[PDB]
Design an enzyme around this catalytic site. Sequence first.
Site, short mmCIF file in Angstrom:
data_model
loop_
_atom_site.label_atom_id
_atom_site.label_comp_id
_atom_site.label_asym_id
_atom_site.label_seq_id
_atom_site.Cartn_x
_atom_site.Cartn_y
_atom_site.Cartn_z
N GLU A 182 12.83 -4.50 0.63
CA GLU A 182 12.41 -5.72 -0.02
C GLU A 182 13.40 -6.75 -0.56
O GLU A 182 13.37 -7.10 -1.75
CB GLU A 182 11.35 -5.38 -1.08
CG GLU A 182 10.09 -4.83 -0.43
CD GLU A 182 8.97 -4.55 -1.41
OE1 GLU A 182 9.20 -4.59 -2.62
OE2 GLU A 182 7.85 -4.26 -0.95
N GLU A 189 5.08 -1.52 4.81
CA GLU A 189 4.37 -1.12 3.61
C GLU A 189 3.16 -2.01 3.52
O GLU A 189 3.20 -3.20 3.87
CB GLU A 189 5.19 -1.37 2.34
CG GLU A 189 6.17 -0.28 1.91
CD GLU A 189 6.91 -0.64 0.61
OE1 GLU A 189 6.32 -1.27 -0.29
OE2 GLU A 189 8.11 -0.31 0.49
O1 LIG Z 1 9.31 3.61 -5.19
C1 LIG Z 1 8.57 4.41 -6.11
C2 LIG Z 1 7.60 3.55 -6.89
O2 LIG Z 1 6.95 2.72 -5.91
C3 LIG Z 1 6.07 1.73 -6.47
O3 LIG Z 1 5.40 1.13 -5.35
C4 LIG Z 1 5.96 -0.14 -4.95
C5 LIG Z 1 6.98 -0.03 -3.79
O4 LIG Z 1 8.04 0.90 -4.09
C6 LIG Z 1 7.57 -1.44 -3.57
O5 LIG Z 1 8.42 -1.43 -2.41
C7 LIG Z 1 6.49 -2.60 -3.48
O6 LIG Z 1 7.13 -3.85 -3.85
C8 LIG Z 1 6.24 -4.80 -4.51
C9 LIG Z 1 6.57 -4.88 -6.01
O7 LIG Z 1 6.40 -3.61 -6.66
C10 LIG Z 1 5.65 -5.93 -6.63
O8 LIG Z 1 5.85 -6.02 -8.04
C11 LIG Z 1 5.98 -7.27 -5.98
O9 LIG Z 1 5.17 -8.28 -6.58
C12 LIG Z 1 5.77 -9.58 -6.53
C13 LIG Z 1 5.32 -10.30 -5.26
O10 LIG Z 1 5.93 -9.69 -4.13
C14 LIG Z 1 5.71 -11.78 -5.32
O11 LIG Z 1 5.18 -12.49 -4.21
C15 LIG Z 1 5.19 -12.39 -6.61
O12 LIG Z 1 5.52 -13.73 -6.66
O13 LIG Z 1 5.81 -11.73 -7.72
C16 LIG Z 1 5.41 -10.34 -7.81
C17 LIG Z 1 6.14 -9.73 -9.01
O14 LIG Z 1 5.78 -10.38 -10.22
O15 LIG Z 1 5.66 -7.23 -4.58
C18 LIG Z 1 6.40 -6.21 -3.86
C19 LIG Z 1 5.86 -6.23 -2.44
O16 LIG Z 1 6.45 -7.26 -1.67
O17 LIG Z 1 5.36 -2.41 -4.37
C20 LIG Z 1 4.85 -1.06 -4.45
C21 LIG Z 1 3.61 -1.07 -5.35
O18 LIG Z 1 3.93 -1.58 -6.65
C22 LIG Z 1 5.01 2.37 -7.39
O19 LIG Z 1 4.27 1.35 -8.07
C23 LIG Z 1 5.65 3.31 -8.43
O20 LIG Z 1 4.64 3.99 -9.17
C24 LIG Z 1 6.55 4.32 -7.70
O21 LIG Z 1 7.19 5.19 -8.64
#
Ligand SMILES: OC[C@H]1O[C@@H](O[C@H]2[C@H](O)[C@@H](O)[C@H](O[C@H]3[C@H](O)[C@@H](O)[C@H](O[C@H]4[C@H](O)[C@@H](O)[C@H](O)O[C@@H]4CO)O[C@@H]3CO)O[C@@H]2CO)[C@H](O)[C@@H](O)[C@@H]1O
Length: 358
Positions: A162, A282
């Site tokens: 990411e 993902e």
């Molecule tokens: O790795 C263990 C851990 O995983 C978590 O799951 C995560 C994935 O690991 C992660 O790669 C994926 O990335 C997300 C990110 O978490 C979000 O917060 C983010 O949201 C952004 C968005 O992309 C933007 O467009 C927007 O403008 O802002 C928001 C943030 O404010 O988006 C990315 C995806 O591109 O998300 C997975 C799910 O959260 C688990 O949550 C955790 O429990 C594990 O331990």
Amino acid sequence: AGGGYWHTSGREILDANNVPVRIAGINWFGFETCNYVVHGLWSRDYRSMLDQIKSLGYNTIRLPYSDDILKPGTMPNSINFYQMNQDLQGLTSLQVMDKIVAYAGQIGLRIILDRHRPDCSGQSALWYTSSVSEATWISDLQALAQRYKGNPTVVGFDLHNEPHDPACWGCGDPSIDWRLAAERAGNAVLSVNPNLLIFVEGVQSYNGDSYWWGGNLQGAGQYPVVLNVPNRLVYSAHDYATSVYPQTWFSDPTFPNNMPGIWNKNWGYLFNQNIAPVWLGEFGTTLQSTTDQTWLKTLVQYLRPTAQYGADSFQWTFWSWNPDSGDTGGILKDDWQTVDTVKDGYLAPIKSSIFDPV
Ligand SMILES: OC[C@H]1O[C@@H](O[C@H]2[C@H](O)[C@@H](O)[C@H](O[C@H]3[C@H](O)[C@@H](O)[C@H](O[C@H]4[C@H](O)[C@@H](O)[C@H](O)O[C@@H]4CO)O[C@@H]3CO)O[C@@H]2CO)[C@H](O)[C@@H](O)[C@@H]1O
């Protein structure tokens, strides 16, 4: 199919015998967290877990890791050794990884290593941080490449998880140009094992346009990644629904009709135009809202059902196998045993077949 190391040919991935294969798998996370091992081994034998993944029809495992597991003597800290996992006892995170890779090969599964975090603390927008330099990143990628060189079970590397703002695609500034970084890393990896596939994710913003982190590949067409060994590149994107973030296109009145437009723009075009294969690395959802259910149904169809298109479709690895994922949930339930047959039901038209044992 699936024998030997793979290679690209247009928008498809082909095994060593030139038979097209389709990555239709699942994410099993843990090695990137501060437990230093895949989660769930506190309730299940690893082999019993791998066998169940195979049974459900999933053929590939994206295995997230953090550079921490490469530090000498790093040990797992969330495994239970009573009547299970007896052979993982006393092994370092890396040795436990060798066991998982080995059993996965034998039963006909494949693995894609994913540098998910610079360290177990969290993700990073750029491919390096003050504490984990770019050179460590590259040394570590080369080390893992070297370690599994000759064992086709590990088909390739997902360079960095990411990349997002302030990262850029093509701006020419070496400190934020992910496009240049990926070539730099990819070429280092290929110098060790030139048969590995190199999976390159997208950024977040391109031309003022924002999308999910790792999913914006809008610059790819104009600024392609160019590697030293041809037919090894596969672009990658991530896409989520409201359970993760209530993006605005979900509020669009024509939803879900607007979705394929968004998808085509950010990543689909590379596939549609036959530039290179595209892998949705993902994607997941709790399926709580009617919107995510429609989003999933819609997306599953867009990725192209195996019955109709076979291997001439998008590669995918769902998120996640783990039930402990904040806003996506997983295929298994909270007991690490019961399958969520419902969520699992949605992925059926795009699942493919198990590969040949390695
Ligand atoms: O790795 C263990 C851990 O995983 C978590 O799951 C995560 C994935 O690991 C992660 O790669 C994926 O990335 C997300 C990110 O978490 C979000 O917060 C983010 O949201 C952004 C968005 O992309 C933007 O467009 C927007 O403008 O802002 C928001 C943030 O404010 O988006 C990315 C995806 O591109 O998300 C997975 C799910 O959260 C688990 O949550 C955790 O429990 C594990 O331990």
